[PDB]
Design a protein around this ligand. Structure first.
Ligand SMILES: N[C@@H](Cc1ccc(O)cc1)C(=O)O
Ligand SMILES: N[C@@H](Cc1ccc(O)cc1)C(=O)O
Lengths: 483, 485
């Protein structure tokens, strides 16, 4: 008669069906154009206007996924995807999320699924020790780690925790004087968190950075601005040094910034969404030096640690600060109750993802995985240096190379050249790279990170970059880009 | 040599294993005690203290999943789970997340994956029309819909959009005078969202409700509280009526509340996290009557619509209000292709539209309506069995497939409350079933929320038998002195 929507046998049948469908995808992903080539509004035309009144077969659905959905995909998993930052996936991360989705438990509290809580605390100490974080950030010591969806939610949590920590001492009425600090290379995650958290929009600070420091935030520039804010009657609150900025993978010196922050009793959050995972390797651990003097530390494991979207790792020194701000139980009362550490009350069993990756691949292989990406970028950097028509614009730090083609006001012309050049490369569908404008210079970002990417794909990307370079420069006229 | 972590053939081999592992789980889930019986800290002792340097096999991990993880699970998907609101799943929903996790794209913007954005706008118009929402909430009309993770996240965005809308008019310095209104039955999503958004803690209102109104918020009482706040120099900002409260599944009258809210220029968010999905059935659509006069509306499709955790559906009349508060573009560019990150907190958006799309297609509106009807029928049957047993009592009117009841003794309330506390915990400890409680109007009452996808009528009858047998046991040896402490 009526089949249960969760029938075990029908679950097994369609389950194996989609597994093969996805294994075929990973096998054939190279045939698709990396950047989707559909036009805006294509999918509403091809789909009905209302939901069907009668059921449709999974076979019919999967066919529409092939003909209607896949064309509208920009293949983050394609081995020739070098845009933005890596959507790092793996087999282990996938299985952990399907076991999480199969169990389908709600981690509202410890009793709703004790394993959904304790396993998270264990793997966060695993991951933290691999990062060689101090004991002040671990359950082993006096700290604590929590898994969240994205970095912006994590930063929003530490921000409100820092906000409540100060306002509870000086009075809630001073919220309009709290100042959030960052560099002009910081992304929305900080400004967006400040907006949601009630910080006054005129009190967000994007401190200028200079080419002389590879656009890392200078603590000296930070102290000047803070003194300007204190003279204006403002209250310094929150500074977010970034290790591996989005634009050029810039690195803010954490230790000098913490020294400035403690003098003014400021919360320090280290934003390592992308590059943080590389600190598992001892030769990269120096990038988060000074994190021992910060209040929180966050990285997106889905950016460069194979878990698949999404899995943000937040380590804090004082979990009570989060609970004091995010819990809804009365203030006086304010086992681990993770729902008081983040925004989400209906937490997902996210620890299985990170638990599978750490066990399936182990520390030794995980270090070399990250090292292989950096080495492929270091090879791409070596190919650029050998072609006199190109230029490395900033120092490579983590597996991403920023470069630009050079022309044979001059900066304005060069920016237009690289914009047109890059767009013709992306329009082929063979590879995909995004750009950035740092210090007024238009530059191309090559972020090696996709799990399927091998050295042949990076060399293949270099050949296309050269062939289009031969194309635009061979017929170059500065009047074609002087508009 | 080392194999690529995303090798297609290894993905195929291990993927089929997990599917068989989960199918076996759904087949045998009844054998586990519903509420986990492990002690706190059991898992830190059974697992190593560091990560392994060398890889471990999927066969080794899966066995550890069986012996270490599953024992520490409270089986929301067990057919004998009637505790908190349902964790509604299905095959179609599971396959949606699997495809979403498989593709593993990031919906940062339209370009990052056009299908990840456009499919969301289409299915939200699908679900909205199923709910008979006015076109002001649809992309066909004036409004739009967005997919988020949880309702508290959706309520936070809706609240900040209401906050910025007001403060942009009168000034940012008045954030300390904005008041957020709810009932004593509203959930902490409203309170938690107020705290994060910068609302002063002393400006959160939990308006008292009464048994005379089944604990639904009275618009007359709301207006009284507003006048006191206005007379005290405060700004009313945001009222959040709830259809299907968490404790007694109470319902607030939307139409008279928006009438009060329109008088004082207040944002109205209709919170229907659990009961919202039931309104695709015409006989239940009356519960969200008056939503035409609210600003936003939210339900949890993972609570009662077979998507899987997580999937929150938020419709708004004015999406630009969300963009103005959540976008990071300068304020003069927000003041003018969908960009869904500007509708929520998360920038790195997940391909959540697949879940909802797979559920709507795989089952259809007709079968989806009947699915919810079967849960309500089973609950109403559970209600009938209780009325036929003179020892039990229905504490509040049942509205959406959840029944509230209590065991009666042969103040009396303190005794009856202690009886049901002992009665309930003795039943839950058996592991045969799991039901949570709530203290509404000073009365301790047991909650029977029928919602687990695998729950059939035989499980409901089985839970009634367990309740009757324990009722015979507790009352058979009853003494006032055993509960008067
Ligand atoms: N938000 C990132 C893009 C990104 C987000 C999430 C990812 O998993 C990967 C890449 C950026 O602007 O660069
Ligand atoms: N917040 C719910 C718990 C819950 C959350 C999500 C669900 O899908 C189900 C139940 C409660 O306290 O009752």
């Amino acid at each position: 008669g009526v089949t249960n929507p969760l029938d075990p046998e029908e679950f097994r049948r369609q389950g194996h069906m989609i597994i093969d469908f996805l294994a075929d995808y990973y096998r054939d992903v190279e045939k698709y154009p990396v950047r989707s080539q559909v036009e805006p509004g294509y999918l509403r035309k091809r789909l009905p206007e209302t939901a069907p009144y009668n059921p449709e077969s999974i076979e019919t659905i999967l066919q529409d996924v092939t003909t209607e959905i896949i064309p509208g995909l920009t293949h983050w998993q394609s081995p020739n995807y070098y845009a933005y930052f890596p959507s790092s996936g793996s087999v282990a991360g996938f299985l952990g999320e399907m076991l999480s989705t199969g169990f389908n438990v709600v981690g509202f509290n410890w009793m709703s699924s004790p394993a959904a809580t304790e396993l998270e605390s264990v793997v966060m100490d695993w991951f933290g020790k691999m990062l060689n974080l101090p004991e002040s950030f671990l359950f082993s010591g006096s700290g604590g780690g929590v898994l969240q969806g994205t970095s912006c939610e994590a930063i929003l949590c530490t921000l409100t925790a820092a906000r409540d920590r100060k306002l509870n001492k000086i009075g809630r009425e001073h919220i309009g004087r709290l100042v959030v600090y960052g560099s002009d290379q910081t992304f929305c995650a900080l400004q967006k968190a400040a907006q949601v958290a009630g910080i006054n929009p005129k009190n967000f600070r994007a401190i200028k950075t200079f080419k002389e420091n590879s656009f890392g935030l200078s603590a000296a520039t930070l102290r000047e601005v803070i003194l300007e804010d204190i003279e204006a009657g403002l209250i310094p609150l929150f500074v977010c040094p970034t290790v591996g900025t989005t634009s050029s993978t810039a690195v803010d010196p954490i230790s000098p910034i913490c020294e400035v922050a403690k003098e003014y009793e400021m919360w320090v959050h280290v934003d390592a969404a992308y590059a943080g995972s590389a600190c598992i390797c001892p030769e990269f651990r120096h990038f988060i030096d000074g994190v021992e003097e910060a209040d929180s530390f966050s990285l997106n494991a889905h950016k460069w640690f194979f878990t698949t979207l999404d899995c943000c790792c937040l380590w804090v020194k004082d979990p009570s600060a989060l609970v004091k701000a995010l819990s809804t139980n009365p203030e006086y009362l304010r086992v681990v109750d993770y729902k008081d550490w983040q925004i989400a009350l209906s937490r997902r069993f996210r620890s299985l993802k990170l638990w599978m990756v750490l066990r399936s691949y182990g520390v030794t292989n995980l270090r070399n995985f990250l090292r292989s990406h950096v080495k492929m970028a270091k090879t791409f950097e070596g190919l650029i240096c050998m072609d006199g028509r190109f230029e490395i614009t900033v120092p490579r730090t983590f597996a991403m190379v920023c470069f630009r083609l050079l022309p044979p006001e001059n900066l304005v012309l060069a920016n237009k050249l690289n914009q047109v050049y890059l767009e013709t490369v992306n329009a082929t569908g063979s590879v995909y790279m995004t750009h950035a404008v740092v210090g007024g210079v238009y530059m191309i970002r090559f972020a090696v990170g996709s799990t399927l990417t091998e050295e042949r794909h990076v060399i293949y990307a270099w050949k296309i970059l050269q062939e289009h370079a031969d194309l635009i420069l061979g017929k170059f006229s500065e009047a074609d880009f002087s508009s």
